[PDB]
């Protein structure tokens, strides 16, 4: 009843599952960046960079080599930027090796279109690390992960 | 070589190369590997049987 | 001085295997029995299996006996 | 050149030894040297050979290094 | 010639059909008539009920769909299953039963393809066919 | 062998100790015992609870050897068939994924070859059994002098 | 209907069988034209399924082979009895358990191997023992050789009944497939008459002679001087001295007034102090209210009375919307097949040892077994090894169903047909999280090294640094603690004192105390969860891959154990359900190895030891765990190093024996991997050499050599590797524990 075939298709690699085909899921994903409509490449980076920035601090904030210093976050802030820009790298080698100078105009598939997706992810992820940054210096419940309120 | 005669393999890549066969049949139609030989030891692949040329057999004594 | 002992015996090591795996591949690609009709290398082709059975059987017979001789002292 | 002074009494160092990841404590124990950094002591005995070969100064091993990259290039 | 229009054997759906690459490089098909409504086993992995009359199944793989053919052959007697390789061009093209009768027997129009007139003693050796065009044969 | 035997007699020699390989080098249990676990020490004393000392580089490698020859243990043991069956519901868990279809590989992803894997864990193998004496010798013979 | 249907001499026992080698095989039966003949005999011996198509002939060797079975064990055990009773310090250990150590075997001096006739006290010495049996036999209230004997007696002449009856059931009155195929009377019966009946007359008979014997032993009356078994069954007065409840008889049972009998049926929980063992009188009890539960739990099934259910009208209803039609056709796949029960059966008895192994360690049920450190550790290390052998054979013979009585046309929308139609999601989540648990469970040790190595010692997971505190296990063992006189109103004590509590310490040594968990116990807990995971996934891959998979559509054919299907599609080696089970082998012994491995050690640094006059223990290791488990290096030196000295240094001891066979399982172990490591091109040509050296000189067997098959080769290796690692953490285990306990 609730598993069936894959879009009416019951030789394809895949079963229509809650998991993966129920309403929730197909609004959810539907409405990502990587997926929602009229979003252009550079917008669907800007908002998943933003995003990803933002937690990549935390974990170098509070676990670096440089955590019991006086430094700790912007150490950590630096460490983001240099992963930032290590995967950028990754987006951008990845654009060049995998997607040929056919223009399919801007559908995230395509050359124009990674390039202007791995751009917004770089400036997008930066700007996150930095919000994350300020918004860590400036606030101590961030800095205490609420250990003072204690 | 006629029919039930020992006969000693000369085929190097065979199983019985310089091993002695009983030839079961001699076909006379004109085929490349006409001579049959049978062997009590089984081959790796498991047959005790081939098909021989009249040059890669000679006859014991 | 063991440093430079045990790196030149690994090295030896690794040479002679080379050296062997080398002989192989030229019996693979490089031989011409024509070439090499009946010379000291179509005779040791000749009589490999000697060769081996007996290399075989020196390799058990020490390690038979050197084996017992350990486990006996031990 | 403080090696050939007492061969059998100093180890010899063979680089020096910039990790990040080194502790206090390691940088400490891999100063044993007496030169003031973490090191690592040659196990490869060119401190004697050369030694035996004549080569007393650190500008004569220089030279033989210089020497060497001419010859690769 | 291949018909798309023939119905499938209900299958319930698997993780083990065809993917991605069946869209953008070979989508091979198989088509065969049954008697009844019998229940086979996908190459691919479960149960499926084949139709009265015909079947068509859609596979990754030429060993899916000759597998699937053999279990027909065997198992049920149906000996009636075409194959057909699909390219995202629709350029379908047919294989088994290639010339109208299995392999297995000979038929009159075939060409030996790869047939060497010696046996495998007689090969040369790659010193021989060494700085040469040669074949070993 | 061969080093075993160099290095054990050695070390004996040096510490003056000569009788210690001359009478426990006629069983295995020596070897294993007034040899290996022996010497062992001073190197797996590197680094401790209590502290570290300049061997630590020597005892990291020594596990560093156990780990990489471990490791080529799966190459030799473990062979293709399984691996490309697995390999093959990891390419379609990677196609069936949202937000991680959206990167596909150039290469079809496979299997090592079976040449290629006797290849990699013949190296594994020979690099752990380098790096493991490696170590061990020349730890413990900077430990013991 | 239930009924009992059998042929009368369906086998006429002769002989002549027994001169023709491979008989039961079609294929065997012709005979040995090469050797690989004499490796299928053994290898095709006991596969009945692959002798004939027919489920009865299966079904009554079946019946016979389990009746040769328990004539086998109760040999095992007549001797095990008579060994106790002749050869052993029994009667010693029970004037002093905690002074002599038990034995019960002797070796003849031949080559000087009288060395190992060590002093194991009480006047005697032999080669000391590590199975239970002298606790055993003292919980059972055993106080005599002359017991020992009669029980070796019994032992024997079950093992005559037994053999007795499975030839009689071969070839005198074989019952038919309709008398096997009772699933419904079978559960029935075994369920209320064999395990109900069985505790029942456990408990009758730890209430008529155990608990009166074990109380006067405890009191400290000799053994000489305790009265006999019979004295106390007709005596009700001596009996109602030690437990004064039976001078009221039954009238309390059968008027339901029970607390009548509080004084031998209690509740009492925690360890009896004198023993160090679980209060008998507790024993007794458990074991009627099994009695009761199970015989209750036997009246489930329909058998002739229309009273009952049907197994298959239950699974066929247990059916929902994410499994199409649910259990349907398993009732008749469990009541054809021989394998998926097989398979079950296996995975639940390897599961119940795993389970007995760590109960039976924390919560010691016989007198004086928990002071018997050579014991603990030996049973749950030997338990934990079978339970692990039991699941991969489970997973073999589910494999084994897959291939050969799996089908697809009984098993439609089902949920078999359902798992093998997304058995690709399953191994790729199995997959991932086996990647996971890698990384977060050993890379964690991998890091602790790495900053032990580079003095950054603040930077480790410790608890001395970043914490991983098994705050859910604490809590559990809190709630544990805690839970007498509060969620188990009626209990004097603990169920088990390493929740916590106070030490119990017999003969001045520790035979319970708290086990706490830190961040070392979160580690290595979190490593058995990724060996488990990772066994999981190969033997779970192999079975559900059995059939098809994307490389090979067509594996059946194949069949359960094949080498390969040639160096095509890339290669497809080891691509087998069996060769599954081989690796799953390999991870299983992995798994086993650091279980064992965490018990020995978190047991010997933080809970055995000797016990001072301050109230202060003092452990074997003391307390190295907590610091030392942490890191790779203090696993290699602070647990084999350092523990690994008694062994080496057993020479010219009653160890000795150890320490040879310390050596001996490491030449195993080697010697596998030549197995493993290897081909059979390799060795064929080889053998071809010296075949030409052996036809050289006139001869040469008629049973042309082979090498081994590419099976048999990786199941050689496999055995050898096994045999080998066991053997040596059985060397060192016994030769550490008997060291130093
Ligand atoms: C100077 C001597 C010498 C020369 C000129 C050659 C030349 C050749 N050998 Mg080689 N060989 C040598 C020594 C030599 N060999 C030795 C000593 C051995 C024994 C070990 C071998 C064993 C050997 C075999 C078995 C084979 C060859 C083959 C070949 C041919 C192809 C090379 C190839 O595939 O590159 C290989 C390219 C590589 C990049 C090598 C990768 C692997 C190496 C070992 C690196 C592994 C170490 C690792 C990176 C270290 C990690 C460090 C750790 C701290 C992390 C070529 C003609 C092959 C051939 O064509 O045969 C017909 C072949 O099958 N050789
Ligand atoms: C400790 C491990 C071990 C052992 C014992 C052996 C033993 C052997 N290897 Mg080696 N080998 C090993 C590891 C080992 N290998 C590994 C890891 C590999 C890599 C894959 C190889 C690869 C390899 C190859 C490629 C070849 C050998 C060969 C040999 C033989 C060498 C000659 C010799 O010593 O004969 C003496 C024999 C022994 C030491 C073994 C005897 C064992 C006991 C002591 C005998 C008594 C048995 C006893 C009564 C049984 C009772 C038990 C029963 C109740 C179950 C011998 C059979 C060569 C060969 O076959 O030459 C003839 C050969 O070609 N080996
Ligand atoms: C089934 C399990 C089992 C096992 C593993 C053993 C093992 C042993 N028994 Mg045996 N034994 C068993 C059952 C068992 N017994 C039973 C059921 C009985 C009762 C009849 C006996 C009665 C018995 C006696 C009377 C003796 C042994 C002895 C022995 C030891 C030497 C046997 C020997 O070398 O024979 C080799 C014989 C060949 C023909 C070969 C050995 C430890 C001997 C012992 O412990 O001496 C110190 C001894 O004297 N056993
Ligand atoms: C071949 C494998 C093997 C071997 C050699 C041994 C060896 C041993 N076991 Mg056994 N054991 C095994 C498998 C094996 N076990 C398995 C698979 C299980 C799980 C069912 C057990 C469960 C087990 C228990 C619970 C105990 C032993 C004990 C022992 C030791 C004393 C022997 C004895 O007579 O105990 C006689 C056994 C008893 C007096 C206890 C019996 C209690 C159980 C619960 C009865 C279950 C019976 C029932 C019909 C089984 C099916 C259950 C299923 C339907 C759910 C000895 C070391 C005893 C021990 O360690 O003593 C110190 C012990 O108490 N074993
Ligand atoms: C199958 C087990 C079994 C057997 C054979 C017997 C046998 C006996 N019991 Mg019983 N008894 C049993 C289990 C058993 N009991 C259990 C589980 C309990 C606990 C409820 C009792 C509690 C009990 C009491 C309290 C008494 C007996 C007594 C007796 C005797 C008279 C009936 C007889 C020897 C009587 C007797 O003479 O005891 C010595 C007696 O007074 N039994
Ligand atoms: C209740 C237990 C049980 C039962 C009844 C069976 C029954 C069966 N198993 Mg087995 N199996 C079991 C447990 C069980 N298994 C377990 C626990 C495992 C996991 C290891 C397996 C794994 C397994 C596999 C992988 C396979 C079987 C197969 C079989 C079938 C044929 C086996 C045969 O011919 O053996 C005959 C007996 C032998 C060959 C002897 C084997 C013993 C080896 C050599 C080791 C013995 C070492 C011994 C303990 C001594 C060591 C000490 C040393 C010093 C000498 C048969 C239906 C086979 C099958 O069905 O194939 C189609 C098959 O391939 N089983
Ligand atoms: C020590 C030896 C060793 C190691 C390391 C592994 C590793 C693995 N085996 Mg196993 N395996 C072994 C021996 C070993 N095996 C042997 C001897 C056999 C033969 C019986 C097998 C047979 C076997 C099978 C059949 C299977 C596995 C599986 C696995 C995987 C388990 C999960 C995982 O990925 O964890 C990941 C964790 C690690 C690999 C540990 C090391 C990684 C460290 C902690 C991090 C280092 C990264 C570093 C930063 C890189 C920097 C590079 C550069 C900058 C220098 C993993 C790849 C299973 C699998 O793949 O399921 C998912 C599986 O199916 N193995
Ligand atoms: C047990 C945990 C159950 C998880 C919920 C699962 C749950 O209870 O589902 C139960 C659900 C109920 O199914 P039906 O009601 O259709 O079936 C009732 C059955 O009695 C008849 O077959 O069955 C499924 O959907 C199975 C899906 C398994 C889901 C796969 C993911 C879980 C894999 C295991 C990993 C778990 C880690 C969890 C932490
Ligand atoms: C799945 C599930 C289960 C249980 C409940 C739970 C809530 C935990 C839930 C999971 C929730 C999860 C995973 C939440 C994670 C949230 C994350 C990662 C949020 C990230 C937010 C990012 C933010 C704001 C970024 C702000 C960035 C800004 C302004 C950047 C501005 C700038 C940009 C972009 C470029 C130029 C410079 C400038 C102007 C500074
Ligand atoms: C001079 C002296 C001083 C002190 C007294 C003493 C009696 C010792 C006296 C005499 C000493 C003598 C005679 C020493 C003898 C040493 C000898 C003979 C050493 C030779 C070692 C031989 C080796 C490695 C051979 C390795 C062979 C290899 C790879 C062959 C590989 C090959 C293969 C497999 C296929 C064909 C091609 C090729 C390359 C040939
Ligand atoms: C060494 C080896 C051989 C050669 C080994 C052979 C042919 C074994 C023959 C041994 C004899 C006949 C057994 C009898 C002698 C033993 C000492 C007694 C113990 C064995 C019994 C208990 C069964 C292989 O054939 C082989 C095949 C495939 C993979 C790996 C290997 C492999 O490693």
Redesign the pocket.
Do not use: A, N, W
């Given at each position: 009843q609730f598993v069936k075939p894959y879009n009416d298709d019951p030789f394809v690699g895949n079963l229509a599952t809650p998991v993966s085909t129920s309403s929730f899921t197909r609004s959810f994903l539907s409405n990502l960046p990587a997926y929602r409509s009229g979003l252009s490449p550079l917008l669907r980076g800007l908002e998943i960079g933003m995003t990803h920035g933002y937690f990549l601090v935390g974990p170098f904030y509070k676990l670096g080599p440089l955590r019991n210093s006086d430094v700790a976050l912007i150490s950590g802030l630096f460490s983001s930027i240099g992963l930032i820009i290590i995967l950028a790298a990754c987006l951008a080698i990845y654009g060049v090796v995998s997607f040929n100078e056919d223009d399919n105009t801007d559908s995230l598939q395509t050359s124009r279109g990674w390039k202007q997706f791995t751009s917004g992810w770089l400036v997008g992820s930066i700007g996150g690390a930095s919000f994350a940054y300020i918004l860590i210096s400036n606030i101590v419940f961030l800095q205490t992960s609420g250990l003072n309120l204690i | 070589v006629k029919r039930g005669s020992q006969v000693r393999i000369l085929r190097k890549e065979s199983y019985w190369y310089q091993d002695v066969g009983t030839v079961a049949t001699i076909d006379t139609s004109g085929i490349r590997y006409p001579v049959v030989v049978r062997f009590e030891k089984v081959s790796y692949s498991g047959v005790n049987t081939n098909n021989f040329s009249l040059d890669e057999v000679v006859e014991v004594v | 001085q063991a440093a430079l002992y045990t790196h030149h015996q690994y090295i030896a090591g690794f040479l002679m295997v080379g050296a062997f795996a080398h002989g192989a591949i030229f019996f693979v690609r490089d031989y011409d029995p024509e070439q090499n009709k009946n010379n000291v290398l179509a005779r040791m082709l000749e009589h490999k299996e000697a060769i081996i059975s007996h290399l075989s059987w020196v390799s058990l017979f020490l390690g038979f006996h050197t084996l017992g001789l350990y486990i006996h002292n031990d | 050149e403080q090696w050939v002074l007492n061969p059998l009494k100093v180890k010899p160092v063979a680089h020096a030894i910039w990790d990040p990841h080194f502790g206090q404590p390691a940088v400490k124990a891999f100063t044993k040297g007496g030169v003031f950094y973490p090191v690592n002591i040659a196990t490869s005995g060119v401190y004697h050979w050369w030694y035996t070969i004549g080569m007393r100064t650190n500008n004569d091993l220089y030279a033989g290094s210089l020497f060497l990259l001419f010859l690769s290039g | 010639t291949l018909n798309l229009q023939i119905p499938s054997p209900t299958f319930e759906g698997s993780t083990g059909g065809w993917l991605r690459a069946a869209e953008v490089e070979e989508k091979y098909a198989i088509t065969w008539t049954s008697g009844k409504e019998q229940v086979f086993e996908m190459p691919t992995g479960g149960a499926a009920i084949m139709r009265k009359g015909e079947n068509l199944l859609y596979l990754a793989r030429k060993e899916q769909c000759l597998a699937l053919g053999t279990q027909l052959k065997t198992g049920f007697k149906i000996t009636d299953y075409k194959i057909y390789r699909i390219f995202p061009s629709g350029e379908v093209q047919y294989l088994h039963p290639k010339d109208g009768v299995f392999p297995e027997k000979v038929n009159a129009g075939r060409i030996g393809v790869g047939n060497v007139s010696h046996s495998i003693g007689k090969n040369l050796n790659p010193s021989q066919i060494k700085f040469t065009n040669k074949s070993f044969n | 062998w061969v080093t075993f035997y160099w290095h054990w007699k050695h070390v004996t020699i040096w510490q003056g100790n000569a009788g210690q390989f001359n009478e426990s080098s006629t069983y295995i249990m020596g070897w294993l015992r007034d040899y290996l676990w022996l010497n062992s020490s001073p190197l797996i004393n590197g680094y401790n609870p209590f502290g570290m000392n300049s061997l630590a580089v020597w005892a990291w490698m020594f596990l560093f050897g156990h780990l990489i020859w471990a490791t080529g243990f799966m190459f030799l043991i473990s062979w293709r068939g399984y691996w490309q069956e697995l390999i093959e519901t990891l390419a379609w868990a990677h196609e069936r994924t949202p937000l991680a279809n959206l990167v596909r590989w150039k290469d079809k992803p496979v299997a090592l070859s079976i040449v290629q894997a006797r290849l990699v864990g013949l190296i594994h193998f020979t690099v752990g059994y380098v790096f493991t004496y490696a170590a061990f010798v020349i730890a413990s013979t900077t430990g013991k002098f | 209907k239930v009924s009992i249907t059998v042929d009368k001499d369906p086998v006429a026992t002769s002989f002549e069988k027994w001169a023709q080698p491979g008989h039961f095989s079609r294929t065997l039966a012709k005979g040995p034209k090469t050797t690989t003949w004499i490796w299928n005999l053994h290898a095709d011996a006991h596969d009945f399924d692959s002798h004939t198509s027919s489920l009865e002939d299966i079904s009554r060797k079946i019946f016979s082979a389990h009746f040769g079975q328990l004539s086998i064990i109760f040999l095992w055990?007549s001797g095990?009895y008579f060994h106790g009773a002749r050869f052993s310090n029994y009667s010693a250990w029970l004037s002093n358990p905690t002074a002599v150590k038990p034995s019960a075997q002797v070796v003849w001096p031949i080559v000087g191997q009288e060395v190992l006739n060590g002093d194991v006290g009480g006047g005697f010495q032999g080669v000391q023992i590590t199975?239970?049996?002298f606790?055993?036999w003292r919980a059972s209230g055993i106080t005599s050789e002359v017991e020992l004997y009669w029980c070796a007696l019994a032992g024997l002449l079950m093992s005559g009944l037994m053999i007795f009856a499975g030839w009689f059931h071969y070839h005198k009155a074989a019952p038919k497939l309709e008398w096997f195929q009772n699933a419904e009377s079978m559960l029935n019966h075994?369920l209320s008459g064999?395990?109900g009946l069985?505790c029942l007359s456990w408990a009758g008979h730890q209430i008529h002679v155990s608990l009166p014997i074990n109380k006067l032993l405890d009191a400290g009356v000799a053994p000489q001087e305790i009265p006999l078994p019979h004295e106390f069954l007709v005596n009700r007065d001596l009996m109602a001295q030690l437990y004064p409840s039976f001078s009221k008889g039954l009238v309390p049972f059968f008027t339901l007034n029970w607390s009548e009998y509080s004084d031998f049926l209690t509740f009492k929980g925690g360890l009896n102090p004198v023993t160090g063992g679980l209060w008998l009188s507790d024993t007794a009890h458990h074991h009627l209210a099994l009695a009761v539960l199970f015989i209750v739990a036997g009246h489930m099934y329909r058998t002739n009375w229309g009273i009952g259910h049907s197994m298959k009208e239950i699974l066929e209803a247990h059916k929902g919307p994410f499994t199409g039609e649910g259990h349907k056709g398993l009732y008749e796949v469990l009541i054809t097949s021989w394998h998926a029960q097989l398979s079950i059966n296996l995975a639940?008895?390897?599961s119940?040892?795993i389970i007995?192994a760590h109960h039976?360690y924390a919560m010691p049920?016989?007198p004086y077994?928990a002071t018997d450190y050579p014991?603990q550790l030996?049973?749950f290390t030997?338990?934990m090894w079978?339970?692990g052998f039991?699941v991969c054979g489970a997973a073999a013979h589910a494999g084994i169903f897959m291939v050969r009585d799996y089908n697809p046309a009984q098993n439609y929308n089902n949920l078999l047909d359902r798992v093998i139609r997304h058995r690709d999601a399953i191994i790729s989540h199995l997959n991932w999280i086996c990647i996971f648990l890698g990384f977060h469970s050993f890379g964690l040790y991998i890091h602790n090294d790495t900053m032990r190595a580079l003095g950054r010692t603040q930077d480790m997971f410790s608890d001395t640094a970043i914490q991983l505190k098994p705050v859910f296990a604490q809590w559990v063992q809190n709630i544990h603690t805690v839970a007498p006189g509060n969620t188990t109103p009626n209990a004097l004590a603990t169920a088990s004192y390493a929740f916590g509590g106070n030490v119990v310490s017999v003969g001045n040594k520790v035979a319970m105390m708290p086990i706490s968990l830190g961040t070392a116990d979160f580690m290595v807990h979190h490593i058995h969860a990724f060996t488990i995971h990772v066994t999981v996934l190969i033997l779970l891959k192999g079975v559900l891959f059995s059939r098809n998979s994307r490389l090979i559509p067509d594996k059946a054919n194949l069949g359960f154990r094949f080498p390969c299907d040639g160096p095509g599609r890339g290669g497809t080696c080891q691509s087998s359900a069996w060769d599954s089970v081989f690796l799953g082998l390999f991870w299983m012994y992995n798994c086993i190895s650091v279980v064992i491995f965490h018990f020995s050690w978190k047991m010997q640094s933080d809970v055995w030891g000797t016990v001072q006059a301050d109230n202060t223990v003092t452990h074997i290791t003391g307390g190295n765990f907590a610091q030392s488990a942490i890191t790779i290096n203090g696993w290699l030196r602070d647990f084999l190093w350092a523990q690994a000295s008694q062994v080496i240094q057993s020479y010219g001891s009653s160890l000795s024996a150890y320490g040879l066979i310390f050596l001996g399982a490491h030449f195993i172990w080697a010697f596998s991997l030549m197995f493993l490591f290897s081909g059979r091109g390799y060795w064929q040509e080889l053998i071809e050499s010296v075949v030409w050296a052996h036809n050289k000189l006139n001869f040469a067997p008629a049973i042309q050599p082979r090498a081994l098959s590419i099976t048999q080769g990786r199941a050689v290796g496999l055995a050898h590797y096994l045999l080998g690692g066991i053997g040596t953490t059985w060397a060192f285990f016994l030769a550490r524990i008997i060291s130093v306990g």
């Open positions: - | - | - | - | - | - | 055990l095990m199975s239970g049996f606790q055993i075994h064999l395990l069985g639940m008895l390897g119940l040892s007995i039976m049920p016989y077994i014991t030996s049973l030997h338990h079978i339970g039991c």
